[PDB]
Write a protein that binds this DNA or RNA. Structure first.
Ligand code: ZN
Ligand code: ZN
Length: 1263
DNA sequence: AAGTCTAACCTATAGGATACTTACAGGGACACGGCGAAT
RNA sequence: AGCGAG
DNA sequence: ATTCGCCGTGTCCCTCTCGCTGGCCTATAGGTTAGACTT
């Protein structure tokens, strides 16, 4: 494999016949009976190749020795049967045809190149109007006079005819008058002939005038006749040609367009376009820019446009165009055969017709047929009507195999079915270890079949590979002995679709299990989002030693305890385990065997010599595992204070002793944590366990953390059972004051309803009043309920301990359901007053159904919206790979980090764990000329945050991805800590995909609540769409004058400088202005960019008026606000990576002198390089401006056409790449994935991919 | 058993003469085109 | 065309 | 009436993944091809 470039471009007919191994003539596929491809047919062996390996049509050649020889009678080259898959055919068109893509795709590249228009082009090519290929006008000055004489002569003849007609009409009128006056009749009767003669002469002179005007019109057109015009009125074309056919050439159809392109200079058109843009303006300027792009695509490159009009069409080989019998031997081909056959039929008929010689009408018709058929072949449905086979189904065309999901790109390149794989339903495997997963032997046998045969053949269980195959297929007993051996230390990847985030795929060590279900360690469930209710999961087998190393090291379950999103652990006790630990470690005052300071009657009688004595006592009904006792701990480090006081500085604690007023349950728990962890002595509410595991991961090695979570799972499962947390109707206690307060609130509801009946307020007013009153009612009922429940209740125990569920669910269970959403989104003002325990009545259930159904449908659609957003984010930010240890730059954003309180205090800012942690300092922290507290270029973790807060400093400068000064991808330090590892990132981590996936996975959790505020808001922000309500923002400092205009608000910002008074008047009075320390108090000195009105701010205007730093900060701020409304913790640095990928192009206004379009987007790096280059050898430095692109446009406007082709708009991307003759460099993750070579991320980078290993000198010595 | 030697079969071409004349979502975005002031 | 998991 | 600047309307590519089940009529010359004897 030696790949470097895919330089797609226009394929001229010469190349088409160059590829072709032959030329299919007739539309004959397969013989009726012998089932053999015909000669010169669409499958002919001589053209494509032999359908059977080592054979030929007549069959006189069958041996392999004379390979590569073509027979005599039938002329079939003796090669492999598979060579048909590659050799390609072609067909010669009698008349040229136009490629559908360039002609019809909007904007019409053909029209832009030839200055013509879409409907006009449709008319000329499809034989509806004529076009002039060229005309030579230079020798027309004398010809002007000569033809003037000729036309004067014919006009004299026309006048002769006209006066003859007039004289004849006059004679007829005289005769009619003589005949009428010769007989007596009505006066009107005898003057009717006079009227008729008058009308007849009138219409005669009218016709003469009209034809004279037509002659004069065609004369004027001839005076100013030029090429590139549509001659509608075929009769006029016939007149023009049969009178002056010579010296000017006209044509119709694709041949006419080809002639027009031939007699045309690209350089002249390019120079004209340059001149117009040099002196143009307005929409004329924009059209000039677009057409200049189209033409300069050809001009700058060596690809001429003559390849757009096709003389020969290629034929995809046969095996990509199957023809196979099936079912009852019924042949079942594909649709391309019909399209190709139609093209062939049209072509043969056209050839014959031209040969025989037919009137231009029929040949034009046949050419039109061939044109529309080639269009359907290349792209069905793009023009005319979708050619529909039987059943009115649009036949698949060659283009269709690209677009959409079913196309090649998204279906068989970016994801493929794989061998050595399987799937099954999953079940909880609590006896498993974290790094283990079960495997039903009926599946492991089939997966490892390749291996078991080897290990048994070499064990002589069989005597050859085939015999071993028999043993496996027979499932003979010995296999289960060898299988159990060939499976050990052989990881397998467990996957669960959808693979929302990076943790979806995890490598486990498999162990044999009986049954039919993949046993899954429960801890990893949260990583997979799996719940054992019928979930199916897939097992994949990594074969190669490199792959097995990747499975063991990179992807093993125990090596991945922290979510890449924000570092929150995922393999931590959850749900059942949380309840078990909460029961184990809580402290109930009054349980059996308390520690009492008794005197006189007896000593304390609460102390215990060792936890051994404690467990022995607790085995009998003497002590409870949640009672306060004074134990003598001798194997656990005490808390910080006890150790620091008793032992002073360095008191080791594997063999010492100390008193602890704890609960035996807590001692049991703390024995689970490592030997070094200080005794915690608390109640393990879920947040506490999260903190414990996070501390362990940050400080302790990974193996210790994995073992600790394993033991925590064990203890939690063991103790949740004895916790007796069960649900029963006696354990769901209704509040006692329900009826009275409900009656009082209903009385208030009746009062407001009476007010409505008197017209005191409108129906919306009373609806709002009822909704608000009943919301107060729900608040009161919930408060009373939470008051009533004692902590020992199973439901409140489950909820309070953080095992699962929110409290509002318990309010519904025993309380009232509250308001119920009307399907539009409003609130049904009844509202439900019956608790699910008490049993809803019929109408209340029917009302609740609205909310349930709308929730389900919203989830169904939002899942797809989230998936699409994830795909777009992944495509924008795939190239962002950490590929340098250090920028060594000096820039970097700042962080608020606990700003001072108004009274004076370092109240911690709410957002630190998602915007301050895991960064590298761009500066050194000094307080009031104090000592340097923390040094530059060091990882910033929680101890440094506590140090900073203690110091008295809040503003901090931190290195960030936004200010990364690297060329290709971000550098390590500018990125900072990696969440999953907890250390500084490697120099191969594909952090872009991590950012995209961690930003996308929270999706399907943000419910929409006019300016959007849910997932669609995040979509708008990333896509950079203009917001709905454009709240105007200030442009300059100074006091502001505000007036409540007629249905709007007028605002004038006094510019501090001599700026123009920015005045805004067209604002809906409904929207309220921004509020601040006042609702834009008249005269406020809002800054040059403060949002004046309260609403949404366009990122484009913010960038324009404040700069890239501010727009980056604003985008990250808004996206974080949207994600945090639902309490999701995601570090910005992912969002900053996305924003960085959005802001990497600059729009230019000065052409410089190096092939730059004013207003074309170009990446910053090449922009600066071009500016530096052009500064040398004639200084015209192009001055550009930053632009904020949308994610989709950023994905499309890339340097590689493969990624853009596979992303979306495949036809447009391919046409553009063909015209520009672009060349992919195969330097992207997605690309190398398609062509199946190592991705330049992780282990595929040159540094790690080229490691060389040989044993050390001492190792060679030991041999 | 291919190499003749014998005897069919099958199919692209062609040919026959009343009369008959017009089938049968939605959203965003951009590009192709209405309405108005200026020269 | 129907269905399971999210 | 053309220029330039606005609006206005029409036509088109995109919105998650992974499983499973079933359901006319000849006439003729030339190409082509069946079977059989053999040394
Ligand atoms: Zn042959
Ligand atoms: Zn950097």
């Amino acid at each position: 494999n030696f790949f470097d470039e895919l330089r797609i471009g226009l394929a001229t007919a010469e190349d088409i016949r160059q590829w072709s191994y032959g030329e299919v003539k007739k539309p004959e596929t397969i013989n009726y009976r012998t089932l053999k491809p015909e000669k010169d047919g669409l499958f002919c062996e001589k053209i494509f190749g032999p359908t059977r390996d080592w054979e030929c049509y007549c069959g006189k050649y069958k041996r392999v020795r004379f390979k590569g020889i073509i027979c005599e009678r039938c002329g079939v080259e003796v090669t492999r049967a598979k060579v048909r898959r590659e050799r390609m055919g072609h067909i010669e068109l009698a008349a040229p045809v136009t490629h559908i893509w360039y002609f019809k795709g909007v904007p019409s590249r053909l029209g832009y190149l030839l200055d013509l228009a879409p409907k006009d082009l449709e008319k000329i090519i499809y034989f509806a109007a004529y076009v002039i290929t060229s005309v030579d006008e230079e020798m027309r000055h004398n010809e002007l006079s000569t033809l003037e004489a000729e036309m004067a002569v014919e006009r004299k003849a026309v006048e002769d005819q006209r006066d003859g007609e007039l004289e004849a009409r006059a004679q007829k009128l005289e005769a009619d008058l003589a005949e009428l006056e010769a007989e007596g009749a009505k006066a009107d009767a005898r003057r009717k002939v006079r009227d008729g003669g008058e009308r007849e002469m009138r219409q005669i002179r009218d016709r003469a005038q009209r034809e004279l005007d037509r002659l004069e019109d065609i004369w004027s057109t001839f005076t100013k006749l030029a090429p590139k015009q549509l001659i509608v009125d075929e009769n006029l074309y016939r007149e023009l040609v049969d009178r002056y056919g010579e010296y000017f050439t006209g044509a119709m159809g694709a041949e006419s367009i080809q002639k027009l392109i031939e007699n045309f200079d690209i350089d002249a058109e390019a120079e004209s376009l340059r001149d117009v843009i040099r002196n143009g303006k307005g929409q004329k300027k924009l059209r000039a820019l677009k057409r200049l792009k189209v033409v300069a695509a050809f001009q700058q490159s060596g690809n001429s446009p003559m390849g757009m009009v096709l003389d020969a069409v290629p034929v995809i080989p046969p095996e990509l165009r199957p023809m196979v019998q099936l079912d009852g031997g019924r042949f079942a081909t594909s649709d391309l055969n019909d399209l190709y056959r139609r093209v062939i039929n049209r072509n043969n008929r056209l050839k014959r017709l031209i040969d025989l010689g037919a009137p231009e009408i029929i040949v034009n018709n046949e050419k039109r047929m061939l044109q529309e058929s080639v269009d359907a072949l290349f792209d069905n449905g793009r023009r005319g009507r979708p050619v529909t086979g039987p059943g009115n189904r649009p036949l698949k065309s060659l283009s269709d195999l690209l677009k959409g999901k079913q196309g090649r790109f998204r279906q068989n390149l970016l994801g493929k079915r794989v061998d050595y794989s399987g799937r099954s339903v999953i079940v909880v495997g609590p006896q498993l270890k974290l790094h283990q997963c079960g495997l039903p032997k009926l599946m492991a046998l089939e997966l490892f079949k390749p291996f078991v045969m080897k290990r048994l053949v070499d064990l002589n269980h069989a005597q050859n590979i085939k015999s071993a195959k028999r043993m496996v297929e027979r499932q003979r007993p010995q296999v289960w002995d060898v299988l159990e051996e060939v499976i050990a230390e052989h990881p397998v990847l467990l996957n669960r679709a959808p693979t929302l985030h990076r943790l979806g795929i995890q490598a486990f060590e498999p162990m044999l299990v009986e049954g039919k279900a993949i046993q899954l360690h429960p801890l990893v469930c949260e990583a997979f989002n799996a719940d054992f209710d019928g979930d199916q999961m897939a097992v994949h087998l990594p074969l190669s030693a490199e792959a097995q190393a990747e499975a063991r090291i990179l992807m093993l379950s125990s090596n991945n305890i922290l979510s890449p999103a924000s570092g929150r652990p995922l393999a931590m006790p959850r749900l059942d385990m949380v309840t078990g630990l909460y029961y184990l470690t809580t402290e109930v005052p009054g349980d059996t065997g308390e520690y009492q300071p008794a005197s006189g009657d007896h000593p304390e009688t609460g102390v215990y010599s060792s936890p051994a004595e404690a467990i022995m006592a607790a085995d009998r009904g003497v002590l409870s595992v949640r009672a306060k006792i004074k134990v003598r701990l001798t194997q656990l480090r005490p808390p910080v204070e006890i150790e620091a006081e008793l032992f002073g500085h360095s008191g080791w604690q594997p063999g010492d002793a100390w008193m602890a007023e704890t609960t035996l349950g807590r001692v049991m728990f703390n024995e689970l944590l490592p030997l070094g962890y200080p005794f915690v002595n608390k109640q393990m509410h879920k947040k506490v366990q999260a903190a414990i595991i996070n501390d362990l991961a940050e400080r302790y090695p990974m193996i210790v953390v994995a073992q600790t979570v394993d033991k925590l799972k064990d203890a939690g499962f063991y103790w949740a059972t004895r916790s007796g947390v069960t649900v029963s109707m006696a354990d769901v206690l209704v509040p006692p004051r329900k009826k009275e307060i409900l009656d009082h609130y209903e009385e208030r509801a009746d009062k407001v309803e009476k007010q409505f009946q008197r017209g005191a307020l409108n129906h919306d007013e009373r609806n709002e009043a009822l909704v608000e009153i009943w919301k107060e009612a729900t608040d009161e009922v919930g408060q009373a309920l939470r008051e009533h429940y004692p902590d020992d209740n199973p439901i409140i125990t489950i909820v309070d301990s953080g095992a699962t569920g929110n409290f509002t669910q318990t309010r519904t269970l025993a309380g009232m359901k509250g308001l119920v959403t009307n399907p539009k989104g409003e609130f049904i003002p009844r509202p439900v007053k019956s608790s699910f325990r008490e049993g809803l009545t019929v109408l209340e259930y029917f009302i609740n159904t609205h909310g349930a159904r709308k929730g389900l449908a919203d989830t169904a659609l939002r899942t797809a919206d989230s998936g699409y957003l994830t795909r777009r984010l992944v495509d924008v930010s795939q190239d962002v790979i950490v590929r340098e240890h250090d920028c060594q730059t000096e820039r970097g954003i700042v962080v608020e980090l606990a700003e001072r309180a108004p009274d004076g205090t370092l109240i911690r800012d709410p957002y630190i764990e998602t915007s301050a942690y895991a960064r590298t300092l761009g500066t050194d922290a000094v307080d009031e000329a104090g000592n340097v507290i923390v040094e530059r270029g060091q990882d910033l973790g929680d101890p440094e945050i506590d140090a900073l807060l203690a110091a008295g400093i809040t503003q901090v400068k931190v290195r960030s991805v936004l200010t990364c000064a690297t060329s290709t991808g971000v550098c390590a330090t500018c990125y900072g800590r990696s969440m999953a590892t907890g250390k500084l990132v490697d120099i191969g981590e594909a952090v872009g995909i991590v950012a995209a996936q961690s930003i996308g996975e929270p999706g399907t959790q943000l419910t929409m609540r006019d300016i959007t505020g849910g997932l669609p808001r995040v979509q708008e922000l990333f896509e950079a769409r203009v917001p709905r309500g454009k709240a105007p923002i200030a442009d300059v400092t100074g006091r502001v004058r505000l007036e409540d205009g007629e249905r709007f608000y007028k605002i004038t910002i006094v510019p501090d400088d001599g700026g123009e008074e920015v005045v805004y008047d067209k604002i809906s009075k409904r929207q309220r202005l921004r509020v601040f320390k006042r609702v834009l108090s008249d005269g406020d000195h809002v800054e040059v960019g403060q949002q004046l009105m309260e609403g949404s701010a366009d990122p484009h205007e913010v960038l324009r008026v404040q700069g890239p730093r501010e727009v980056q900060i604003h985008l990250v701020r808004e996206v974080q606000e949207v994600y945090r409304a639902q309490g999701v913790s995601i570090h910005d640095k992912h969002i900053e990576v996305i924003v960085r990928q959005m802001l990497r192009r600059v729009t230019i206004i000065d052409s410089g002198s190096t092939e730059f379009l004013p207003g074309s987007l170009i990446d910053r790096a090449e922009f600066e390089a071009e500016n530096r280059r052009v500064v040398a050898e004639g200084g015209e430095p192009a001055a550009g401006r930053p632009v904020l692109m949308g994610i989709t446009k950023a994905s499309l406007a890339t340097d590689s056409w493969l990624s853009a082709a596979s992303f979306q708009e495949t036809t447009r991307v391919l046409t553009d790449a063909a015209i520009n003759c672009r060349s992919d460099k195969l330097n992207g993750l997605k690309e190398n994935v398609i062509i199946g070579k190592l991705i330049p991320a992780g282990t595929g980078i040159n540094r790690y991919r080229n490691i060389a290993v040989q044993p050390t000198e001492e190792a060679r010595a030991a041999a």
